[PDB]
Structure formats: C-alpha cells, structure tokens
Ligand binder design. Structure first.
Ligand SMILES: O=C1C[C@@H](c2ccc(C[C@H](NS(=O)(=O)c3cccc(F)c3)C3=N[C@H](CCc4ccccc4)CN3)cc2)S(=O)(=O)N1
Ligand SMILES: [Mg+2]
Length: 297
C-alpha cells in the first residue's frame, strides 16, 4: 500500500487521483431531500442523502433527516453519516440515535469554526441543565466528560420519556480537525479512532455508530474510510490487497462527496498505512501514537 503512496507522491498526482474518484463516483437521486417541505432540515443545499440509503425517522409526520446508512458488507460495519444538526433537527437527530439503537456519536467539528456556526449545540454542556426535545419526547443529560487536549469523550444519558427507558450514549468529539483540513497527525487521528473502537460503540451488537462533521462528508468520510480499510486489512489474508480508492468509491455509493480534498485522501493513506502496524501485531505502536498525540496536555 505504501508503494502506491510513494509513487503518487513522486508523481505529484494526488489531485488527479482525487478528481478521478470524483468523476467515477455514483450519482443517485435525492428526491426526498429536495422536497420543498424538507428545505429547512438541510444545512447545505448541495449536500443531500441519496434516497436509497437515507435514514428514515419512525414518525408518521415527516420521516426525513439528512443522514445516510453507509453499509460496508465485506468489512462488516455500518455507519450513519449525518450533517451537524440544525436548531430545528436536534430532536430528529436524537430520535434517529434512539430508533437506530446507536451507542456512540462521533463528532469531528466544533460548533463554531473560524467565526461561522457549523453545528447546533445538540447535547448539554452542563450536568445540571439537561435537554428536552419536545417534538420527540426525549430527555438528554450530560453525565460526565473526559476532556483531553485535542478531543473529549462524554457520557450522556438519553431517555425515552414515553417508556422511561434510559440508554448511555458515548460522545467522541475530535475538537481540532479544521474544516477542509486534516488531523495534526496520523497518530492523533488513530489514537482517537482506537478510543472509539475500544469503547465498544462500534460493536455489531449495537446500531450503526453515528458520525458527523458539518456537512457529514469531508471529515466524516476520512474517519470512516480509514476505519473501514483497517478493518479490511485485519480481515483478509493479504492486507496489502486493500485498494483505498476502491473502498472510497464503494462508500460513495451510500453518500455523496465522502472525502472533500485530495489532501484528506492522502491523509487517509497515511492513517491506514500507519494503522496497519497495530493490525499486523506491533503491540507498542499504540503507546507511541498516544505520546505523539500529546493527549494529556
Ligand atoms: O472537510 C470537510 C468539509 C466540510 C464541508 C463540506 C461541504 C459543505 C457544503 C457547502 N455548501 S455551500 O451551500 O456553502 C456552497 C459553497 C460553494 C459552492 C456551492 F455551489 C455551494 C460547500 N459545497 C462545496 C462542495 C460541493 C459538493 C461536492 C461533493 C458533494 C456534495 C457537495 C464546497 N462547500 C460544507 C462543509 S465537512 O463539515 O463535510 N468536512
Ligand atoms: Mg459545572
């Protein structure tokens, strides 16, 4: 895998490789997303979920949410990629989390980035100030939070007011991943990812983990591509067989525009190439990533 990487770097062909992916990517209808009544449920007019893979709310009224089920068959892992909730779809967001039985939520952006709102504050910042999303009859409470230098893990209690059932939802929030940018290093990215893995939130016993950034395609796509590829390397007889460009195209059949810049594509290679070391056995690389990520700053 690192040979193709090396030749692409030498060829200076990341932009061409990336644009070939954009040109060969699937194109499916998003008619429900474009209905007039769903306009205020979409954050960006040009980022919509395909009809065949969109997540449907269980409500009779309007089952629309800008969210997509990315189902990776060979890797055996599903992910729900959605945009950062809007002030009016925070209820919907948690209704989806509930209905799909998700156990973890991976946030890769901040609410405000370089002076622009990118996502509503959809979870409570203070223990004593819980949230109620009336339209859905769900209560959400911040139970605790473990704040690190570039990421925070939070324990939330989501409750179905109707049946009074409660569930613990884990929130994995990467706070230093610039929009249209890349993580500081493969190490800090992988250190984060393996934290989500180790939590059990990605277990096939739970519903799909919900991943989102602002549009739910660039950073969210980088995160899922890397995870899927590492899963594939550990599954196959010959890990060098994983074609990342092919995997990204498979994912793009489920949601448009996954991976938004050639450099995020390149970062994906680096993250996977670096992550292969743990998958092949190396039992010390994880401590190395942790040190390199300086999480305890
Ligand atoms: O690294 C990233 C990029 C962010 C991102 C991606 C896309 C958008 C949508 C935005 N729409 S717009 O109405 O402000 C806007 C801005 C400029 C031109 C235009 F016609 C509309 C955006 N679209 C193009 C990208 C288009 C696109 C490509 C492929 C699939 C879907 C959309 C670039 N930024 C916002 C943020 S992420 O939160 O997904 N992670
Ligand atoms: Mg306090």
């Amino acid at each position: 895998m690192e040979k193709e990487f090396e030749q692409i770097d030498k060829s200076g062909s990341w932009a061409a490789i990336y644009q070939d992916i954009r040109h060969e990517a699937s194109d499916f209808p998003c008619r429900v997303a474009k209905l007039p009544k769903n306009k205020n449920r979409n954050r960006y007019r040009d980022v919509s979920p395909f009809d065949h893979s969109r997540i449907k709310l269980h409500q009779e009224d309007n089952d629309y949410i800008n969210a997509s089920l990315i189902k990776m068959e060979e890797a055996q892992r599903s992910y729900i990629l959605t945009q950062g909730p809007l002030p009016n779809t925070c209820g919907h967001f948690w209704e989806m989390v509930w209905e799909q039985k998700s156990r973890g939520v991976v946030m890769l952006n901040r609410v405000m980035e370089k002076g622009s709102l990118k996502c509503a504050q959809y979870w409570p910042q203070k223990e004593e100030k819980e949230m109620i999303f009336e339209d859905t009859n769900l209560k959400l409470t911040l139970i605790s939070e473990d704040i690190k230098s570039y990421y925070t893990v939070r324990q939330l209690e989501l409750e179905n007011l109707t049946t009074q059932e409660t569930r613990e939802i884990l929130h994995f929030h990467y706070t230093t991943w610039p929009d249209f940018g890349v993580p500081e290093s493969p190490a800090s990215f992988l250190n984060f990812l393996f934290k989500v893995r180790e939590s059990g939130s990605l277990s096939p016993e739970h519903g799909p983990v919900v991943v989102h950034c602002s549009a739910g395609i660039g950073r969210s796509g980088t995160f899922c591509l890397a995870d899927t590829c590492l899963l594939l390397m550990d599954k196959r007889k010959d890990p060098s067989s994983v074609d990342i460009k092919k995997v990204l195209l498979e994912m793009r059949k489920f949601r448009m525009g996954l991976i938004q810049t050639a450099d995020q594509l390149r970062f994906s290679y680096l993250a996977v190439i670096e992550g292969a070391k743990f998958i092949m056995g190396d039992s010390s690389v994880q401590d190395q990533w942790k040190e390199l990520s300086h999480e305890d700053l």
